[PDB]
Amino acid sequence: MTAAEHGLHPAEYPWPQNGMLSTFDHASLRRGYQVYKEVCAACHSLDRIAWRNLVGVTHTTDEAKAFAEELEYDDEPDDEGNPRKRPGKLADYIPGPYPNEQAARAANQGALPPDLSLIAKARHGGADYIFALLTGYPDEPPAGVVLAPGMNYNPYFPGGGIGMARTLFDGVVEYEDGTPATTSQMAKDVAAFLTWAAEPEHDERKKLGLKAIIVISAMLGLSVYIKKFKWSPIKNRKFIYNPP
Amino acid sequence: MTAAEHGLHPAEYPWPQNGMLSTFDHASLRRGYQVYKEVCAACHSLDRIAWRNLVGVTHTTDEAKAFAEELEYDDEPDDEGNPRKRPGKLADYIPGPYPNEQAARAANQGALPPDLSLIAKARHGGADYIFALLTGYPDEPPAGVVLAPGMNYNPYFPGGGIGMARTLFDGVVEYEDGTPATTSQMAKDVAAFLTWAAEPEHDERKKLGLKAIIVISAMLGLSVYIKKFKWSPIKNRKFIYNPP
Amino acid sequence: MALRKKNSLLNMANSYVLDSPQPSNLNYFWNFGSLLALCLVIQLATGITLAMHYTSHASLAFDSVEHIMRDVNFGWFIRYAHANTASFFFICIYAHMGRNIYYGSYKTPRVLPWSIGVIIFLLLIITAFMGYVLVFGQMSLWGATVICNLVSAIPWLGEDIVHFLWGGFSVGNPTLQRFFALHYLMPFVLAVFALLHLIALHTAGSSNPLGITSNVDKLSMHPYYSFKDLITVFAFLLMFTLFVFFSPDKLGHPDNYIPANPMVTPASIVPEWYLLPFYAILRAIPDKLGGVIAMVAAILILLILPIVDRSIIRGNAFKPISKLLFGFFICNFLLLGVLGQVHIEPPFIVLGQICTIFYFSYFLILLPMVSTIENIFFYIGSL
Amino acid sequence: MALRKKNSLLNMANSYVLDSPQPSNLNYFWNFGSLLALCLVIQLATGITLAMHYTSHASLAFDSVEHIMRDVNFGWFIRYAHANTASFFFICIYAHMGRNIYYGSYKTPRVLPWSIGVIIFLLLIITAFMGYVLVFGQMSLWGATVICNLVSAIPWLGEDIVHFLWGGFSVGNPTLQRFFALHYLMPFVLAVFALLHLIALHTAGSSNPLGITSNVDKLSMHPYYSFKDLITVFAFLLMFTLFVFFSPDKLGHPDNYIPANPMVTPASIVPEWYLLPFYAILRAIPDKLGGVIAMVAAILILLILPIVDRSIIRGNAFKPISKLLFGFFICNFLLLGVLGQVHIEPPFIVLGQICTIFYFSYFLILLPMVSTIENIFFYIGSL
Amino acid sequence: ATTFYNVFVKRNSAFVATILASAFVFDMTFETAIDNFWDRINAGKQWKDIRHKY
Amino acid sequence: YMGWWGHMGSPPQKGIAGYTISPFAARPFAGVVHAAIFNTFRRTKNQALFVILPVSFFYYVWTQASEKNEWLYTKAGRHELAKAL
Ligand code: HEC
Ligand code: HEC
Ligand code: HEM
Ligand code: HEM
Ligand code: HEM
Ligand code: HEM
Numbered sequence A, B: 001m002t003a004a005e006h007g008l009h010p011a012e013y014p015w016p017q018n019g020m021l022s023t024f025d026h027a028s029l030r031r032g033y034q035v036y037k038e039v040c041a042a043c044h045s046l047d048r049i050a051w052r053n054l055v056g057v058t059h060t061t062d063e064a065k066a067f068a069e070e071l072e073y074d075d076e077p078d079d080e081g082n083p084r085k086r087p088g089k090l091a092d093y094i095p096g097p098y099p100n101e102q103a104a105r106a107a108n109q110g111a112l113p114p115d116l117s118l119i120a121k122a123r124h125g126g127a128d129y130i131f132a133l134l135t136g137y138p139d140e141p142p143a144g145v146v147l148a149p150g151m152n153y154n155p156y157f158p159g160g161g162i163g164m165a166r167t168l169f170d171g172v173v174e175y176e177d178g179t180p181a182t183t184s185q186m187a188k189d190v191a192a193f194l195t196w197a198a199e200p201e202h203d204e205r206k207k208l209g210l211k212a213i214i215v216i217s218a219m220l221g222l223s224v225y226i227k228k229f230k231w232s233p234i235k236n237r238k239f240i241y242n243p244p
Numbered sequence C, D: 001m002a003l004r005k006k007n008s009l010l011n012m013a014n015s016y017v018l019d020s021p022q023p024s025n026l027n028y029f030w031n032f033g034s035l036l037a038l039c040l041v042i043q044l045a046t047g048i049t050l051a052m053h054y055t056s057h058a059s060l061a062f063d064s065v066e067h068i069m070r071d072v073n074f075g076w077f078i079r080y081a082h083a084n085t086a087s088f089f090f091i092c093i094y095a096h097m098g099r100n101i102y103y104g105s106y107k108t109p110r111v112l113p114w115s116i117g118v119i120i121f122l123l124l125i126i127t128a129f130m131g132y133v134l135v136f137g138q139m140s141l142w143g144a145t146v147i148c149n150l151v152s153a154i155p156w157l158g159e160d161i162v163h164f165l166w167g168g169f170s171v172g173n174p175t176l177q178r179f180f181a182l183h184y185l186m187p188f189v190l191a192v193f194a195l196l197h198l199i200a201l202h203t204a205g206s207s208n209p210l211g212i213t214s215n216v217d218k219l220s221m222h223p224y225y226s227f228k229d230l231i232t233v234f235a236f237l238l239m240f241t242l243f244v245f246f247s248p249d250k251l252g253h254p255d256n257y258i259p260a261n262p263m264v265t266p267a268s269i270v271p272e273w274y275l276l277p278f279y280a281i282l283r284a285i286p287d288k289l290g291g292v293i294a295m296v297a298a299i300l301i302l303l304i305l306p307i308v309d310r311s312i313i314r315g316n317a318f319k320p321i322s323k324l325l326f327g328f329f330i331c332n333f334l335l336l337g338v339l340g341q342v343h344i345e346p347p348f349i350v351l352g353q354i355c356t357i358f359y360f361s362y363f364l365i366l367l368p369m370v371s372t373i374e375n376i377f378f379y380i381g382s383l
Numbered sequence E: 001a002t003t004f005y006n007v008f009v010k011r012n013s014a015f016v017a018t019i020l021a022s023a024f025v026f027d028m029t030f031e032t033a034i035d036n037f038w039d040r041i042n043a044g045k046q047w048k049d050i051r052h053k054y
Numbered sequence F: 001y002m003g004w005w006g007h008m009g010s011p012p013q014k015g016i017a018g019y020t021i022s023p024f025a026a027r028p029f030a031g032v033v034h035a036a037i038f039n040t041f042r043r044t045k046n047q048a049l050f051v052i053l054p055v056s057f058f059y060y061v062w063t064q065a066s067e068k069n070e071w072l073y074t075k076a077g078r079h080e081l082a083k084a085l
């Protein structure tokens, strides 16, 4: 295909989590949540993440309970069977900005902002694609590109014309840890956070894999010793032939 | 248990559908629907029956479309993602009187009127139980029975005290076929209708069973001829023994 | 040499269904084995078909069964066929175990097929039960609760196992989905074991109603028993047809057409007709662990028939006293069945206990004693 | 006589896993059989476990897979293990069929295990595919559409069959629930066939890398090949671990993490890495029915290797020309794989067609010709 | 009678063809016959019998 | 313990001549009337007590228990039920 139609392939950034023994940087996850909450959540849902999922990853139990308790969720009907709301609990899912797809499209000049819970797994490139996309809006589209109405030029998005405008600008978030909130810093943080969102088991998975690699390596070494040992009578077998 | 705790066992009424080769009387089914619609539907849902299920059983396609089209059902949201209603179609389910259990209980002094789609299969006795129950409210409870508040005495219901009051009285329905709407007639019709509701395949089932009984009988007869035929060399085998 | 003998694959089929040498005098009670095979085939066909339509999620399970009844073409047939064949499977399997106990099929050299059979019997119970739960009606949910709490009898770890088998604090969605997985699986395991007990039997060959060797007089499995087995296939299908088409709910509990409500259990708790004997056993014993042990032991005790039958003669055709004892044992097992479905009230509480003692005393006391005495009566009586 | 030989059940196990006489010189390519057995065991364990957590209803399926990833303890492992082992299963099965083609395992007297094997290969494709669909992501839904429409190729009835398979007018809930049923079932059928092709092989015994008789020099399956198979078990688990724990999504398509939207087909449609060779075949042929036939024929044509290999010598160890031809055939099969995942653009359209012709010409032209010529070269060359 | 045996029964190909063609005829006629019988025993009961009113 | 055709493991047989006729030559239902009536009566009579004795005893036991149970839950059976509990 044309380069345009593919999208530019994102650079491979050296994420903290790249590397067989490397976890996410949880400080970055926390910062990235704050970017999601203050920028992306206006348009994008994170439906597959519950408040409890943040606990002991980015936030303490108490901070996440505070986030849940600020919201109202549908309770069971009252005793007259009238609908009720309750304050959120940790088992509740982070609520979306829009009640349905149609409302989402209405607010976005027809384009549907995807759920971000899985977006790091759902696109070639993963974290790198999210970081490249968020930071990759040129001030001017390359000469000759005709954007469809309500599209913005972003080379990383296939086709070039993405319905999402540039949204990260220096100091749209004020980080609570005093980190300078530059476009690149916020994109890295939110990209990390979203990658965690997509694969939250990541840290545990790599640790168990480390233990497995070690055990399985040792067992493979020993199994080869044992095989050679048991086979040595056959390998070492010698014949004397006296034709009868 | 005491008789009270069991409930009186209902009489075995000679329903049209009793009998291996007997269908429902569809005229009775239609009359019974009219009883459900005009009496029972105030309190009881029939959630498992769709308008299309009445078609070619009790009503023509057109009459059932007319019933569906009188109601409003939840449509897909409009283009701004605002909720909408549409007129009912034949695939829609007959809607309940109450939005939830709690609203049902609120309207029934705490008691929950069960869904009637399955009630003929869900109670020992089936049609007979429904007919016995609906017609079996004595004018006076047997001397000595203490009813709990908001309970009505009905011997067929286990415990004796049922939260459903007597509801069929001579001429609460005006049948469209000019049949005298007596308590017994309406109970028989609605009991038949509910039995159909629980087992709508009844008519087809018994017909296929008739064909199966005939084929399987013939095959059983022939299989016995063939077995005897093939075994006759062994059965007819004779021995002569000459001790050596 | 005939292809059927030459080719390794055909030769295995041949050895089971065609050339297999069978005694020439097997009576109609030898037909249950093939009916259980037919039930197993019907159950697999209807079962896999229901699995194409059934949804294991607790919010949808009961409704998916109603959808099967109402919307799926012939869904009613497939559902009732599956449910009813589960009942016929148990009639046939009690018949088959009956036949085996009466004709001493459990004695050497057939202890192995017998003992594998006892495991098939346990697996059938667990399969059929796991399948009962999938409807997620009232009885379904309660049955799940009780069966998954039989492991609470196991001390210390017991309570935790219960929670582990429920995947929750109560029977709920998790439980229903894991019962679906296992109910689909268990029948294939059961077909393996059914095959294995035949392979174990193939060393000795079938017993016969005289209990003598049949090595003197064998008949090929086909055509003789193939055609003999068709008679019962058609007789079975006649009975199947009468239930499936004419009275599909006679063998069912009304309460299972009520969706599962974890807040109430029906006042009239009565399990499947085939579990009733062991349920009465469980009710009889007033101890938790006791009740469970007795109920499981009622099946596992069949494993000791090879030991406790001390007869020098195989099976009961020729033993008037053993036949009478077997008659009382069978009728007692039916009485237990009956007591399983009355209310837990006087005088049936004491009666159920007496029947439970009689059930166990057949294996532990009466059979060993009667079989010893009849040995002596044969020897003295024929001198 | 040893119990393992006396007892009928043990004797069957014994004959397969312990006393089974194997040639003494099987090399590491004889290890794929047991790896495929291990894959099959892993798939059954993880599969049945996912079935305890997965909900087949289209409204819930994708979400139940996310719930498995996120909420179920070790769900991530079980899911990725199941998904990755499906890839390893195909690496091993191509390796295993590779081994068989290179060493002439398809020749007499092993045509039967070979031919049963070809059916196992088709069943694996259908199993793994039906399994792909259960996620009900974007690639899943489209995959379902495509495969059920391969029956549309069949004229007249074809189109009605498609609707019958879907249970609808499109792939939807009905389809997904029936794929769940059959995906659970298909692996047990596949384990039967895997067992059968071993039983068929047990008449001739394993071939060996020299292609000579091994009747002169046999070695018990255990301990020698048991311990030899452990080496590859651990080597397999090392590779499994690297994928499952470190890169679980390397072998996956991102688009399957988008829920199924029947309105849009991903611009970049590319199936599982293992179906790619036949997908390129399907893309190559411009006719509908042609494309389908060719794709199926690419598997079924393996059935004719027993006929078209005219060699008097079993396998390729000693045939330089055949080894070169086999090298080009394998590389062409890998090229087809590669062309399966490029865009349908020049010049790869023509290239894919040339590779498709080369694929078929190996069975129809080259193998018969080369094998004939090498026969003559052996005879003349040794005179 | 020999003739009938020779034509329809002697060759198994012919016998199986005859059985399947008879099964076809039986299947079609049995269906029709039971349909009519079922309508006669349940006369005035079934939807087809009251449909005319609407 | 059982062999296969040719080596079934019968003690050597000698001196038994077995004769049978073709299924086509025999009437498969010959003497069916006689058998259905007289033979089945014979076989039923000989086994009757083995069924009748346990069925009649356990039917008696059930009958007594069900009648007592019924009676205990009447007004007349109030006192005997109070003792039983
Ligand atoms: C006010 C709107 C809006 C805001 C703010 C917004 N987005 Fe989006 N986003 C969209 C829309 C609309 C699309 C769909 C674009 C399309 O498909 O043409 C989208 C698409 C995306 C995509 C995927 C594009 C693709 O490959 O399909 C990612 C990833 C993304 N957004 C992440 C973010 C992150 C991270 C933020 C902020 C930190 C963010 N978005 C802020 C509206 C928004
Ligand atoms: C205004 C209320 C009301 C009307 C009208 C009503 N019911 Fe009910 N019905 C109930 C309530 C409440 C119960 C629950 C009683 C209880 O469980 O104590 C009930 C219970 C039943 C039951 C089952 C009782 C049981 O066994 O659980 C059936 C059957 C039934 N109704 C059928 C009907 C039919 C048929 C009609 C009219 C043709 C009807 N009902 C009219 C309120 C009503
Ligand atoms: C799925 C369930 C089962 C099937 C399909 C099955 C099938 C069979 C078959 C076909 C036979 C040989 C023919 C026959 O005697 O009827 C047989 C024999 C036998 N079965 Fe079963 N069986 C099953 C369950 C059981 C159970 C639960 C037991 C024991 C508790 C059992 C014990 C035996 C024994 C001991 C034999 C040898 C009996 C003899 O021929 O004397 N089987 N079974
Ligand atoms: C021995 C084999 C089997 C037995 C004894 C058995 C028994 C049962 C029983 C008793 C039920 C309850 C039926 C009801 O009351 O509705 C049931 C339900 C079910 N069975 Fe099976 N079953 C068997 C095999 C299978 C198999 C192989 C499948 C394959 C999936 C299966 C799938 C189902 C399903 C989906 C249900 C629930 C839907 C329903 O209730 O009808 N069964 N089974
Ligand atoms: C579930 C998949 C399969 C399993 C588990 C399996 C397993 C095995 C095993 C254990 C052996 C004996 C040891 C060995 O040679 O590696 C074997 C041999 C064989 N398999 Fe497979 N197999 C499978 C699929 C296939 C397929 C797809 C084919 C052919 C297309 C095939 C054809 C053969 C042949 C021809 C042999 C004899 C080869 C020889 O030893 O020379 N198998 N298989
Ligand atoms: C040869 C054996 C098997 C193969 C090759 C196979 C292959 C697959 C594949 C490729 C998937 C898609 C996985 C994904 O991308 O998420 C899958 C999913 C699934 N398989 Fe299997 N499978 C096998 C056996 C089984 C068995 C025995 C079960 C028993 C139910 C099973 C249950 C599932 C379930 C529930 C899913 C969907 C959940 C998921 O995607 O992880 N599989 N299978």
Ligand SMILES: CCCCCC[C@H]1C(=O)O[C@H](C)[C@H](NC(=O)c2cccc(NC=O)c2O)C(=O)O[C@@H](C)[C@@H]1OC(=O)CC(C)C
Binding pocket: D012, D013, D016, D017, D022, D026, D027, D030, D031, D033, D034, D035, D036, D037, D040, D041, D191, D194, D195, D198, D206, D221, D225, D228, D229
């Ligand atoms: C347990 C009783 C049932 C018998 C079947 C069990 C398994 C069985 O036969 O195991 C054997 C170990 C067999 N390998 C060989 O023949 C073998 C022969 C020569 C060389 C090597 N390796 C070289 O270095 C071998 O590995 C094997 O891996 O075959 C599995 C597939 C079988 O499972 C099944 O078919 C059932 C199902 C799980 C597929």
Ligand SMILES: O=C1C(O)=C([C@H]2CC[C@@H](c3ccc(Cl)cc3)CC2)C(=O)c2ccccc21
Binding pocket: C122, C125, C139, C140, C142, C143, C144, C146, C147, C269, C270, C271, C272, C275, C276, C278, C279, C282, C295, C296, C299
């Ligand atoms: O209380 C019980 C109960 O006890 C069983 C019982 C009876 C048979 C038992 C059993 C018998 C034999 C074996 Cl080998 C294992 C379990 C299983 C539990 C049920 O099936 C049941 C179903 C529905 C509601 C309540 C109940």
